[PDB]
Amino acid sequence: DTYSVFTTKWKQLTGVDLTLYKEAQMKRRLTSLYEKKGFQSFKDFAAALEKDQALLNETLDRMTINVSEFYRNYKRWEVLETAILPLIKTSRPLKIWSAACSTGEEPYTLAMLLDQQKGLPGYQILATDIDEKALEKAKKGVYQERSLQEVPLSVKDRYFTQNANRSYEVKTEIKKNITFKKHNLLADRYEQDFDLIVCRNVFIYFTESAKEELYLKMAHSLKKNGVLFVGSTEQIFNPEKFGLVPADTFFYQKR
Numbered sequence: 577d578t579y580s581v582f583t584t585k586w587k588q589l590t591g592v593d594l595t596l597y598k599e600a601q602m603k604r605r606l607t608s609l610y611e612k613k614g615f616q617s618f619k620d621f622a623a624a625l626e627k628d629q630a631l632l633n634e635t636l637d638r639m640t641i642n643v644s645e646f647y648r649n650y651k652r653w654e655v656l657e658t659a660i661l662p663l664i665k666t667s668r669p670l671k672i673w674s675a676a677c678s679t680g681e682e683p684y685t686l687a688m689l690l691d692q693q694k695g696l697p698g699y700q701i702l703a704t705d706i707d708e709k710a711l712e713k714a715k716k717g718v719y720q721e722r723s724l725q726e727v728p729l730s731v732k733d734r735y736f737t738q739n740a741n742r743s744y745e746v747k748t749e750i751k752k753n754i755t756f757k758k759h760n761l762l763a764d765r766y767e768q769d770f771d772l773i774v775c776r777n778v779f780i781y782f783t784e785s786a787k788e789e790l791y792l793k794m795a796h797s798l799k800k801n802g803v804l805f806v807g808s809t810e811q812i813f814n815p816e817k818f819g820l821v822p823a824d825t826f827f828y829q830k831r
């Protein structure tokens with residue numbers, strides 16, 4: 577099976593195991609991507625990826641639909657703000673994970689939302705992705721207005737400089753609370769004791785079996801009463817089996 581042989585090679589080069597991704601769907605996206613570059617097989621595509629780092633980094637950067645924006649599904653962030661933050665705040669700083677942060681819109685949202693919380697003891701956000709080019713971009717912190725349409729104007733004025741007409745940059749007072757790190761949700765060790773884990777619009781790529789395994793690792797990585805925030809098409813069935821209780825739509829609390 578040519579995709580089988582290719583999956584083996586990709587795992588060896590990047591540690592990413594495509595057997596843990598929906599097959600028909602990823603197989604089609606990657607066929608499309610090698611064909612656009614005029615490869616004629618996975619075999620030939622694999623050979624180039626081993627010899628061209630840029631092609632490899634480009635391919636990781638193209639294995640999902642990764643366009644993002646601040647406050648993606650804006651009303652869910654008000655839920656987080658009003659309904660969820662009271663459940664998780666304690667006397668200690670909040671420890672947050674933005675798991676699959678892409679170009680950084682999400683973790684920056686989290687930081688700007690949390691900074692507005694007067695008297696919150698502190699906040700710490702780990703922001704991870706497998707895509708190093710997206711992490712590079714997130715670190716730089718420069719966004720075009722298209723990524724900021726849901727940022728309320730006072731928040732945009734407070735936490736970014738506007739450097740040109742539709743070009744803004746996140747201030748250091750926000751960046752300093754975020755650590756951008758290369759990390760594979762499917763393979764790498766998870767830190768522990770998070771108050772909040774935000775993992776949105778990534779599980780959609782994984783097989784049912786792979787994401788079920790990741791819900792249990794996440795439930796484990798939460799402090800008791802901590803919360804998991806998922807994407808607006810995602811759902812965990814029988815959350816009680818993971819020791820999670822649904823808090824509002826798309827939020828799960830560790831009991």
Ligand SMILES: Nc1ncnc2c1ncn2[C@@H]1O[C@H](CSCC[C@H](N)C(=O)O)[C@@H](O)[C@H]1O
Pocket residue numbers: 636640641642643644645648675676677678679682704705706707710759760761762775776777778781807
């Ligand atoms: N195994 C894996 N571990 C970590 N990140 C992964 C991954 N597989 C894919 N990704 C990343 O998942 C991202 C999905 S885009 C979603 C970004 C953001 N959470 C939002 O909601 O808009 C991409 O940046 C892709 O690089």
